[PDB]
Write an enzyme that holds these catalytic residues in place. Structure first.
Site, mmCIF file in Angstrom:
data_model
loop_
_atom_site.group_PDB
_atom_site.id
_atom_site.type_symbol
_atom_site.label_atom_id
_atom_site.label_comp_id
_atom_site.label_asym_id
_atom_site.label_seq_id
_atom_site.Cartn_x
_atom_site.Cartn_y
_atom_site.Cartn_z
ATOM 1 N N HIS A 151 0.915 -1.246 0.000
ATOM 2 C CA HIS A 151 0.000 0.000 0.000
ATOM 3 C C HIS A 151 0.893 1.215 0.000
ATOM 4 C CE1 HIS A 151 -3.270 -2.718 0.904
ATOM 5 N NE2 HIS A 151 -2.623 -3.178 1.975
ATOM 6 N N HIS A 202 5.169 7.055 6.692
ATOM 7 C CA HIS A 202 4.940 6.656 5.333
ATOM 8 C C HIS A 202 4.405 7.847 4.565
ATOM 9 C CE1 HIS A 202 1.117 6.277 7.349
ATOM 10 N NE2 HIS A 202 0.610 6.748 6.204
ATOM 11 N N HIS A 231 1.743 9.125 1.035
ATOM 12 C CA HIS A 231 0.770 8.898 0.009
ATOM 13 C C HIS A 231 1.126 9.819 -1.149
ATOM 14 C CE1 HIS A 231 -1.910 6.936 3.017
ATOM 15 N NE2 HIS A 231 -1.246 7.761 3.846
ATOM 16 N N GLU A 254 -3.736 13.437 0.755
ATOM 17 C CA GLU A 254 -5.025 12.964 1.360
ATOM 18 C C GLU A 254 -5.809 14.159 1.849
ATOM 19 O OE1 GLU A 254 -4.027 9.467 3.824
ATOM 20 O OE2 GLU A 254 -4.792 8.444 2.030
ATOM 21 N N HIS A 301 3.015 11.105 6.563
ATOM 22 C CA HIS A 301 2.329 10.824 7.814
ATOM 23 C C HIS A 301 3.321 10.230 8.802
ATOM 24 C CE1 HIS A 301 -1.727 10.600 5.617
ATOM 25 N NE2 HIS A 301 -1.375 11.837 5.913
ATOM 26 N N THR A 309 -6.524 6.732 7.667
ATOM 27 C CA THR A 309 -7.014 6.896 6.295
ATOM 28 C C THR A 309 -6.941 5.622 5.490
ATOM 29 O OG1 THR A 309 -4.918 7.500 5.329
ATOM 30 C CG2 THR A 309 -6.227 9.329 6.303
#
Ligand SMILES: CCCCNC(=O)c1cc(S(N)(=O)=O)c(Cl)cc1Cl
Ligand SMILES: [Zn+2]
Length: 257
Positions: free
Chosen positions: A61, A91, A93, A103, A116, A195
Site C-alpha cells: 500500500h 509513510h 501517500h 489525502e 504521515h 485513512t
C-alpha cells in the site's frame, strides 16, 4: 483485498470496514477561512533527537520507515495533545502526477504527496491498544510539493529500489526524521481516523501549514515502486491516497493567525 483500484479502492472499503461512513473519518478538506484560530493551542513539541529508525518496509500500500518504539525516544507532545505520543512509523501517500497525491486538501488544493508520522499515546502502552481508543494516535501530516530537492529525503529514495515489491524490507538504521520537517510548525488540527483500513477513529490529526519541497526526481522514484509482489505483473504504486471525507460534526482549529 482492499487497495487503491476501481474494484478495491476507497469507494469499496465500507463493505469490509463499515466505519468508512462514520462520524470522524479522514482525510478532510481544510477550508482555511472556516478553521478557528485557537489561542489555547500550544506549540507543537516534536522531539526526534533520539529517534532510532530500524527498517524500511514495502507493505504493498505504501512503504513504512519503522522505529524502535520500546523506549521513550522520538515523541510528539504539546499542540492540541494531552500527554506524550511516541513515533512508531512514517509513510507517504502520492499521486501518478504532481497535481494529486495528498489525502488532506487545503481549500480543495491537492499536493503532490503527503507524509504521515504516526505516533501512539503512551498512556495505552502499545500501538495495538492505542488504536482502540479515541485519543490513541497522533499523526503529524506534512504536504509535499515538487520543486527543489529535500536532501533529508534522499536516503529514503535511494533504498527504494531494494524494496520494490510488496513484502520487501531493508535495514534502515540512523535515519533522522528531523530532515523531513518544514521550518514552521504552524498547524491545523481535528479529530479523525486512520485513512487506510481498518479506518479506526482514533487519531488526532496535526497537519502542518508549510509544505516541504521535494524534487521531481525524488517523487519519480516513489512512483517506480510496485503494489505487487515479486514475480507478479507490474502495477505501479501510485495514487495510494484516500479522497477527502465529509467533515460532519467537526471543527478544524488553527494554531496560527
Ligand atoms: C494495515 C496497515 C495498512 C497501511 N496503513 C498504515 O500503515 C497506517 C496508516 C495510518 S494514516 N494513513 O492514517 O496515517 C495510520 Cl495512523 C496507521 C497505520 Cl498502521
Ligand atoms: Zn497515511
Amino acid at each position: 483485498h482492499w487497495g487503491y483500484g476501481k474494484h478495491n479502492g476507497p469507494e469499496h472499503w465500507h463493505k469490509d470496514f463499515p466505519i468508512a461512513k462514520g462520524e470522524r473519518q479522514s482525510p478532510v478538506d481544510i477550508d482555511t477561512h472556516t478553521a478557528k484560530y485557537d489561542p489555547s493551542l500550544k506549540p507543537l513539541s516534536v522531539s526526534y533527537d533520539q529517534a532510532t529508525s530500524l527498517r524500511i518496509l514495502n507493505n504493498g500500500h505504501a512503504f513504512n520507515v519503522e522505529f524502535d518504539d520500546s523506549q521513550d525516544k522520538a515523541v510528539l507532545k504539546g499542540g492540541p495533545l494531552d500527554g506524550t505520543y511516541r513515533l512508531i512509523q512514517f509513510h507517504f501517500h502520492w499521486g501518478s502526477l504532481d497535481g494529486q497525491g495528498s489525502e488532506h486538501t487545503v481549500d480543495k488544493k491537492k499536493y503532490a504527496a503527503e507524509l504521515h508520522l504516526v505516533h501512539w499515546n503512551t498512556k495505552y502502552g502499545d500501538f495495538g491498544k492505542a488504536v482502540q481508543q479515541p485519543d490513541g494516535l497522533a499523526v503529524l501530516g506534512i504536504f509535499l510539493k515538487v520543486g527543489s530537492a529535500k536532501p533529508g529525503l534522499q536516503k529514503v529514495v535511494d533504498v527504494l529500489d531494494s524494496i520494490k515489491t510488496k513484502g520487501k524490507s531493508a535495514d534502515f538504521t540512523n535515519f533522522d526524521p528531523r530532515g523531513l520537517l518544514p521550518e514552521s510548525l504552524d498547524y491545523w488540527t481535528y479529530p479523525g481516523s486512520l485513512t487506510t483500513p481498518p479506518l479506526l477513529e482514533c487519531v488526532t490529526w496535526i497537519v502542518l501549514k508549510e509544505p516541504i519541497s521535494v524534487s521531481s526526481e525524488q517523487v519519480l522514484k516513489f512512483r517506480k515502486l510496485n503494489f505487487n509482489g515479486e514475480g507478479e505483473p507490474e502495477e505501479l504504486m501510485v495514487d495510494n491516497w484516500r479522497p477527502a471525507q465529509p467533515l460532519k460534526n467537526r471543527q478544524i482549529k488553527a494554531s496560527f493567525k
